[PDB]
Amino acid sequence: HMMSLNDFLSSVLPVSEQFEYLSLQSIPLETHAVVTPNKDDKRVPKSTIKTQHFFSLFHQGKVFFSLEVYVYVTLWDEADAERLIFVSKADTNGYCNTRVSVRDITKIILEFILSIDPNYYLQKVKPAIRSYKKISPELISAASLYLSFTCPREILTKICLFTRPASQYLFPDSSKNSKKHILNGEELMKWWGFILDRLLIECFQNDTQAKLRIPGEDPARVRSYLRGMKYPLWQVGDIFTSKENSLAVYNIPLFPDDPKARFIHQLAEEDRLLKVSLSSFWIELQERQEFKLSVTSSVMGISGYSLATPSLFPSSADVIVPKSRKQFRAIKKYITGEEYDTEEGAIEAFTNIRDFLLLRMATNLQSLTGKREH
């Protein structure tokens, strides 16, 4: 019954109220392995395909919500494959005048991503190394590829996120808006906890790994929080392997803009990736992120199989895929490059996105009427 991104969103938005959304997507591309291969490994992923999804929700001619998600599909062979959803950034600007559930909106967008057939990303992949021939300008006289793969539809699915509080993620200076509710680190952890817990109950099989760690904290308080979860199998810790010595570098996934990756790079700069085990990693991560602006960070991981086989190829109503990386960045930058100290930023972002889509792509933002009763 729920099929399109329109169906999903509509279902969590309030009865009879008008919204619009942007669903933007980069062109899938070959990338480095999510986790640094080691020389003892039997598998090197023959290929890792990365795709960014960027979402914005609008009400009454103003942007008010945005969400940045990456989907990696890792290929080992014809027969085995893994998908990973990395939730990078979510944000609010406080420029919405009706009551909505921002967590049910985030949950349901994630539920849309989970329903996508991983083969959708594999049909046309921009290669990591591209062949090229250049014509030197001497030849003009005065008289004058994409890769494709397949995997099974039902594959191991993982979700990784890292909670850390900030004034803003996607809306510069939105903290200057007095209507903006800025979550502290504890609220933020519990807000993402609720979402993933619902995702488990609604979309995952009962044999799914669900993990939480609050780095640099003793695991005693984590276990307390988790007792209030409705999915029965939450455990303290993470979904990461323990290859090599439990060296962190061979186990830690390297995501865009992510604190785990930023510290891995820091360690690389000191020649210490052969010396920092996982247990130390979390300790030393804590101390630098903490001592920078002391604050609760959490790391959450899901790993298991969907209750329903993903088989959707998003239509043009579900996603807009710009022809270029520059066009992708230009559209996104109308949202992220704007100032949100006044409601005018939320208006200009709407105005600019709408005009760009109409003039350069003859496409409108999608409109929805909410269906959820009070």
SS3 162: strand
CB atoms within 10 A of CB 218: 8
**Of 174, 130, 179, 134, which Cα lies nearest the Cα of 349?**
174
d(CA 363, CA 365): 7
d(CA 277, CA 284): 10
d(CA 272, CA 42): 24
- Amino acid code (one letter) for 215: P
Beta bridge partners of 156: 82
**Of 26, 14, 184, 16, which Cα lies nearest the Cα of 105?**
14
Between vectors from CA 275 to CA 271 and to CA 280, what angle results, nearest 5°? 115
Q: How far is CA 274 from the centre of its chain?
A: 29
DSSP 73-93: EEESSSS-EEEEEEEEEEEE-
Between vectors from CA 158 to CA 152 and to CA 162, what angle results, nearest 5°? 155
Task: Read off the tokens for 22.
Answer: 């942007």
Task: Read off the tokens for 156.
Answer: 């191991």
Please say if 258 is a catalytic residue: yes
CA distances from 178 to 63, 94, 165, 343 (A): 16, 8, 17, 11
CB atoms within 10 A of CB 325: 12
d(CA 84, CA 158): 4
DSSP 202-270: HHB-TT-EEEEE-TTS-HHHHHHHHTT-SSTTEEES-S---GGGSBGGGTSB--TT-HHHHHHHHHHTT
Resolution to 1 decimal place, in Å: 2.2
Annotated binding-site positions: 90-92, 99-103, 162, 166, 181-183, 191
Residues 117, 173, 218, 258: which is the catalytic one?
258
d(CA 299, CA 164): 9
d(CA 85, CA 198): 16
Residues 165 and 188: beta-carbon distance below 8 Å: yes
Residue with tokens 């992708």: 328
Phi, psi of 282 (to 5 degrees): -65, -40
Q: How was this structure determined?
A: X-ray
Annotated binding-site positions for acetyl-CoA: 90-92, 99-103, 162, 166, 181-183, 191
Task: Read off the tokens for 42.
Answer: 């039997």
SS3 131: coil
d(CA 332, CA 233): 38
How is residue 312 annotated by DSSP? B
